[model samples]
Target: VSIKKSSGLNFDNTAIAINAGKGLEFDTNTSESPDINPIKTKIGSGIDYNENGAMITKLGAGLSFDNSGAITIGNKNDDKLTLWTTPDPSPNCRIHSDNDCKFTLVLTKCGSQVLATVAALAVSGDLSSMTGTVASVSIFLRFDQNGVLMENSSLKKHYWNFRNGNSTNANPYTNAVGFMPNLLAYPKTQSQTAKNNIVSQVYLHGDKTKPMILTITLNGTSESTETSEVSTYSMSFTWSWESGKYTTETFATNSYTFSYIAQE
Candidate 1:
């Protein structure tokens, strides 16, 4: 439920921190900083969140971030804590980028696999006309500002490089979103949470005025590779999309480069 605008109130780069203590909370007005388990946490106005006392399995479940803008999430627990948004917006969600649409995930430590999963594929195209056929659209390649993966393997780094020319047979790069193999592998049990609505499947004739918006969630697709189990891989997610198709383009390459980036 959205709160009524009422009159109007605004804050710039505001900050907020929410903390919950074990068995209780600080009431946000404790004489002193509550010294106990606290599930902490959004856009949240450039928020700097920190949860102490204990590992917060889940925080900010119902907590909402200001807007779809700047926000930070931190963890200070001994146990691994998960940050997730449940009952996520049904008809929508948002992504922000300073220059190009990009999301970066960093995984520290080496030897462990860093798997990156995208919740959904959000894309929009500015068609000249409603009847504009496939011409040239901005594609969401894994590495090309789309969705990507990064990790360390056997002391070497492997990934779908969008910032680097990461290409090879094992960890291919610059592949279409819904291709095969390297495409964001779904979480297995559920293979339909992908956020690649528009790019997942395409069967349009022409209609620019209609605009375009598709959301797709990874459907627990095939495993990145049997590596880490048997191959030299840290596995990265990379994709390429310049759009040789859209707005009634000339011809679609139907061509794509798929490979893995690995080192021995």
Candidate 2:
């Protein structure tokens, strides 16, 4: 059946019935009306109607449809629906001239991999005393799940490198590094009650020979204290070149918390 433009057919606030064994099929060129019902009308099993049958089957169990057809199911005690959104492709992550960085993961789904490239600009510092002397700067990578470092996650040191000469003419350095591995080998089963969202952090040190003092805090709480639901995490480092001389450093923090919701 064809719906002519002039017929003014409206399915809004109206119910239509389709008989059993008949399936509604849409023609390739058919146009949908803008005022059509946005509700989840169901298609009865073993029953069908031609060209416009609404399928009505319970979506899994405990699932309910929204006006937009988005499904939300169950309660906090029994359901599991996890959702995540990533930061913009640009500036998703970065390294600097005084640093180097890398991410490694074992991907499961082919297209699930995402890598963002960022420019590593040089930070100015006095290198005059070490003229003609070479200094190597490095960045270390680590991965954590739900704010806790993964058991096997360690410092991937010297993954990338930068060099400075005389500290006067050090050129800016930048490169596009690619994809991180999935690293999630064992997928969680449906019966699992909790899930973790993985987060990656990069730290910089002048050299690996010395012990770097790292101060870690959660959601603005000092290392000695604890806070709840703080949405953000941060870390600072102090590197000492001499017994009394040290340079204090810090970096912008990011959120790495896990939230639970019911499964649909």
Candidate 3:
């Protein structure tokens, strides 16, 4: 309840009286003429304006910097900054759900690759021991439904040589990221409804060298009538990884399960 900026200043409902408070109490014997001169000064009380004589004090809650900077709270509704996803289904949205999700995978060092003169005479020149296979692999599955991130369900596949040279075999040079086959997916027929669908599939396995397994499936259905009323169901899968060299990835053999339904 305040706003001021003029009339040498004076507002008494509680307190506010300047210039006569000794040119607004700064004391040094206060006096620097040009018209009771004191270019600018502020003392709070609430609402007081003056204009040509200058005296402004407006405060009723408005003045915040709080530490530093950064405030951008929503826009781009669904390119993946969602409070909703799909064609658009609004809830208390902020998306990215693969059943309690978190992910990160990076493989860098993009250089040096030349071995095909009879495979560089069987690595005699040491072209990094001539072991290169993964012609293509791109994965970008980003979904943030509970923390606001909606968009990015990808799967790119292309694999050859599967590990013919076998550098200490770990499943054809082992290459597995995260959430390989299962990252929560429940709903074959209701089952407490939780759907933010984004399914991608790609496969090319016929023995390029053998070692590929990715299977994630969660089916659901439930119903109860009476008998004290009981119908509980659950499914879970939470994953994390981002170290290097396909650290380890395998899950989908009953990751989690629960069910109950009583009637009759």
Candidate 4:
């Protein structure tokens, strides 16, 4: 007694707006075309359009991009990322009798290709017989005023602190200013021990005033091994002035070591 069917279909949520440089079109023309020349062809394969067209995507499998855009999700090599070394908590600084002190060592920026190692030791004139109880004078080995051995690429031997009053084994508290005439003229001069330390275990740029340790790539230039980008290798050390009168010692130690890799 009832059979109703006369075409009834209506569905509306009303919300479809794509203005400002609109998009969303993929005709394809799959063998049939009519609706007033409807054959847009297939231009939607991999998808790419830059120069303002905007709509790009092509960096699959572990993705990576570097043209300064800097984007690396993950690739392999264990996703490389490492950085460890911290010892700059105060470092020790104080000056008056000639002035100069800088002992900075802070490096913890994990990830970004880095293999650093910086070691520095400075002792003006005394260490109070290896313990403590005020016996000043630290500047153990950095000379120039005719004593030589202050080359380190002429970064100008750290920076002087306070000359004129030198004494290490002669009493000025414990004797440690400029250490034994350039440590006995650098082993009786073999061309200053082949131009200082006979040739590298670690010493390049050695003391360019501040940021010691060399070899760094990724735009910063100066490489001996490898690195595409990401580098900090924090470093610092410059001292000369613990000059005269006791205690508050710890001349200088400054050290840094690193390891990192993250671009997979």
Best candidate, lDDT:
4
The TM-scores of all predictions, comma-separated, are 0.20, 0.21, 0.17, 0.20
Superposition-based RMSD of candidate 3 using all C-alpha atoms, in angstroms: 21.1
Two-way lDDT contest, 2 vs 3, winner: 2
Error of 3 at 246 (Å): 18
Model 1 spans > 4 angstroms off: 1-100, 104-210, 213-215, 229-264
Against the unseen true structure, what C-alpha lDDT does each candidate score? 0.27, 0.26, 0.25, 0.29
Candidate 2 lDDT score at position 43: 46
Instruction: Give the clash total for candidate 1.
Output: 47
Candidate 2: which stretches are off by over 4 Å? 1-122, 126-208, 220-264
| Per-residue lDDT of model 2, residues 63-165, tens digit only | 5566776667542322212111111111212233212222221111113333222212123433222122222222222222233221121222222212111
Alpha carbon RMSD to native, model 2: 17.7
Superior candidate under lDDT, 1 versus 4: 4
Superposition TM-score, candidate 1 onto the true structure: 0.20
Which ten residues in a row are the worst by lDDT in model 3?
114-123
Tens digits of lDDT, candidate 1, 137-170 = 3322211222233231211123322221121223
Cα displacement (angstroms), candidate 2, residue 252, comes to 16
Candidate 3 error regions (>4 Å): 1-8, 11-197, 204-264
What ordering of candidates by TM-score runs from best to worst? 2, 4, 1, 3
The TM-score obtained by model 2 is 0.21
The alpha-carbon deviation from the true structure for residue 103 of candidate 4, after best TM-score superposition, in angstroms, is 1.6
Q: What 10-residue stretch in candidate 4 is worst by lDDT? A: 216-225
| True-structure lDDT of candidate 1 | 0.27
